[PDB]
Design a protein around this ligand. Sequence first.
Ligand SMILES: Nc1ncnc2c1ncn2[C@@H]1O[C@H](COP(=O)(O)OP(=O)(O)OP(=O)(O)O)[C@@H](O)[C@H]1O
Ligand SMILES: Nc1ncnc2c1ncn2[C@@H]1O[C@H](COP(=O)(O)OP(=O)(O)OP(=O)(O)O)[C@@H](O)[C@H]1O
Ligand SMILES: Nc1ncnc2c1ncn2[C@@H]1O[C@H](COP(=O)(O)OP(=O)(O)OP(=O)(O)O)[C@@H](O)[C@H]1O
Ligand SMILES: [Mg+2]
Ligand SMILES: [Mg+2]
Ligand SMILES: [Mg+2]
Lengths: 51, 88, 401, 398
Amino acid sequence: LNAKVRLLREELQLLQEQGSYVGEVVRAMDKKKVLVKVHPEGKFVVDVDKN
Amino acid sequence: VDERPTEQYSDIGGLDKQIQELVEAIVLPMNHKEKFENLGIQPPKGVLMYGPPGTGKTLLARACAAQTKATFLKLAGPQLVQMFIGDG
Amino acid sequence: PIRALDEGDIALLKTYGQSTYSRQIKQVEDDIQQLLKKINELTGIKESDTGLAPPALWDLAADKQTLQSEQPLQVARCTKIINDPKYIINVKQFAKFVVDLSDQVAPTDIEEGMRVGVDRNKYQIHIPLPPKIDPTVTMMQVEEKPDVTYSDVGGCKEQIEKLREVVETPLLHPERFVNLGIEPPKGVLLFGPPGTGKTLCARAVANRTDACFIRVIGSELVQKYVGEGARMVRELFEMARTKKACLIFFDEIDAIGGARFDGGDNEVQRTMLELINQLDGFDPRGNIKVLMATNRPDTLDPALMRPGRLDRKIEFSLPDLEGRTHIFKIHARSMSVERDIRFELLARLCPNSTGAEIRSVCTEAGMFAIRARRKIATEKDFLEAVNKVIKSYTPRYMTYN
Amino acid sequence: TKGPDAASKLPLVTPHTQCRLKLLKLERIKDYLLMEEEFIRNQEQMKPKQEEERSKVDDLRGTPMSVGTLEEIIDDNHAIVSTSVGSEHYVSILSFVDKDLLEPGCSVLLNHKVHAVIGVLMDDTDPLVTVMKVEKAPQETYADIGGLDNQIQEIKESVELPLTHPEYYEEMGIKPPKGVILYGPPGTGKTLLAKAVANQTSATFLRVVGSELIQKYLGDGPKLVRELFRVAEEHAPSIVFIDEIDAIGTKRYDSNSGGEREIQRTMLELLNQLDGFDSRGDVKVIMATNRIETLDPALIRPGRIDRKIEFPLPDEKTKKRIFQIHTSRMTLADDVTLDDLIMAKDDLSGADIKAICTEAGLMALRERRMKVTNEDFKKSKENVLYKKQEGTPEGLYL
Ligand SMILES: Nc1ncnc2c1ncn2[C@@H]1O[C@H](COP(=O)(O)OP(=O)(O)OP(=O)(O)O)[C@@H](O)[C@H]1O
Ligand SMILES: Nc1ncnc2c1ncn2[C@@H]1O[C@H](COP(=O)(O)OP(=O)(O)OP(=O)(O)O)[C@@H](O)[C@H]1O
Ligand SMILES: Nc1ncnc2c1ncn2[C@@H]1O[C@H](COP(=O)(O)OP(=O)(O)OP(=O)(O)O)[C@@H](O)[C@H]1O
Ligand SMILES: [Mg+2]
Ligand SMILES: [Mg+2]
Ligand SMILES: [Mg+2]
């Protein structure tokens, strides 16, 4: 029962997190910044997560 | 139109019927009005100058603008087309 | 009667044969590909250059100060002034706002129709800005004279004289035309077979234009968004009017000046209609001599070809024998050719060939002279080049004589 | 400058046949590869100032950084940058940006919050164009073409010799031919001679299909062509290969269709880039078409395409050379007298003088033989030559 409750609570907690944008990638820049093209907006030079 | 281009009707040749037609349909109803209402004959609301290219349509328009005290408001077809919706 | 392969047959085929070195070589190739991929991934950067100045150039800790103090300002044009005065400002496409000036600027500075900056929060006007100067339209200028002069154009004395009478003489010596009451033609349409030399004459004019020369790129005028091409044409003609005695070159006018038809081109047709009224109609164009070129004049809209927008129509016909000889001398001036080369014969052997084909023949003769290690190209090399360039691209000639 | 970004390629192994010399060559290449891998793997690990400046610059820049277009430069520390959504912003130019590169039309890099200009995007090349660049050179070299000697010589003089030995052209005074068109029946060796040139060439090689240059949107076609040629010019020595030119090079004709008029506009932009106002620079264009009679005369006129190399159907000597080239790997038998098939009537092309080889190999596999025989080749020819229906007249002429 505790595992079920914890699973549901984690699902609710993750749901509240903002949905992430999706955009194409043009090319890596400096091994830490990647040029991307979000759908409605323009190009963006964004950093990369650790993983 | 603020420069008031100058073109006397004598500069237009070969179109005496058309010049008179344009003056009577775009000018006579303009500065007379009450006379036309007297006879109760509806003046046409607009004049469409159509013909082979270079026949002198724009020249007649310029002549009317020059020899008319009316406030000419020129414009072009391409001018009334803009990207933003409803701008035209 | 064909029989399919089995597992044992496949195994024996891949084993009964060469197996002492085949496996090692195959594994080496696969692992060499893997190593190449590993190296590429390990480097896999090619750090893209960014506009970072030399370290001493910036070396600024007050850049953060200016970033925190200064605030970005949206650029907008004040459509109307209201009377404390209020100002209607169009923020390009965002929306229409009725804002008032900040204390920094004085009311007299802001005039109707001037594009001014506004803060992103309240939309107050903070500073005036110079009127828009389009970047594409401004780059459409030449500002770099090409190195082809009139001496490089041969066989077109009459055509060159007419072109100068249209685009150069009226600008340099207006008196010769004003005295006799002659209004010089404001446009020239260079139509002729491809490779005859229209663009060369245009480059020569730009070289000795001594005025503003604008090369109109057919790509920019045709824009993705509706009404952008007409706006670009209207901006180009305004930028020409602001200058004195400008020269506009509408290269490959058949790119956009196609005959109107009833969506089809539509938008390009609207841009063409915008250029047509700019060239001729209300609001006289001014001192802007338009130069147009096209190898296919029959596809142009009759409005664009009427002698009110393209006043002088110069035909660049295939060079005559004298023209071909002059072209041969012009293109062979630099070539290390022998002194007995009968250029008349080479001209007569190219019956109907433009200047481009003459240059191709000259280059082919040079290449033939380079094939066999000879530093001087003899007339035989030119004859072989003529055969390869014109004749290449007996029984038929048997009848003639 | 931005010199050539030549495609990378490993050295060639000569033995071909699985002899121990080939094994030694491959082992040596692998040894040098492992050498490089170990060196570059130790560099960073074995590695233990500018960090302060980099940290300051990146902290001022912040992330993400928007890419916008610079519209004008008002002052030395102010400019008007129009964000991607079309809205113009009067942003402040920070110190750490070389003012020399800041020109109207360039793609500026802006802070996300204050929009202050923080850098200028250099490459900003259209992704549909950066794909065209050839990174991995094809393995097909010149030795992989049977015959086509005259054609090889012409293509070398046009695209290969000028870079390697420009002295000859400079002394002779003639600018080397900067445009070549490869036209001929299908399966003659057009794309091959292009692959071989790309392999041997040291200049940046750009490949296009003649159908990717056309974009759905109105102005995307001419702008794509301009971007492609600008990228080619950026790498000074370049060869641009527009195969299937007859896709967009069809004869210009009054078309009551924006599609056709858009394709014609793309062709016009191409021919304006090739030879028009402003020199083309050191970019050489190679085009292939199995139909040259349908191309616009302007596109194939001298000046743009300076050498109309013809690729005829192989003759007897050329056919024997293509049998030697495509059978070298195969373990032929003793009785394989290729001349019997080499004779032919008039209509055997490389594709066939290779499909024939593949079919002979497959038929050998059917009988469980890895060594082909004459019967296999005859059957393969009979099976794979079935291309044309009649293509001949009747028994009229004598
Ligand atoms: N009947 C005419 N009388 C006087 N001038 C004329 C006449 N017809 C043509 N022209 C002259 O020739 C030109 C004719 O084109 P105009 O400027 O009148 O525009 P348009 O005829 O409407 O041409 P478009 O069809 O291209 O709009 C002008 O320079 C004009 O002065
Ligand atoms: N009449 C000529 N005299 C000398 N050289 C010429 C001549 N015509 C063409 N050429 C040579 O050919 C080159 C290309 O010709 P050019 O671009 O002027 O032809 P075009 O007729 O303008 O082409 P298109 O009609 O296809 O636009 C010139 O730069 C020049 O070297
Ligand atoms: N002359 C040749 N020598 C060697 N191999 C050849 C030859 N001709 C054709 N081949 C082989 O057959 C293939 C087909 O030839 P290629 O790709 O050059 O055709 P193409 O002339 O471009 O025809 P298409 O019009 O179909 O594109 C080559 O990739 C090569 O493997
Ligand atoms: Mg008109
Ligand atoms: Mg040209
Ligand atoms: Mg091909």
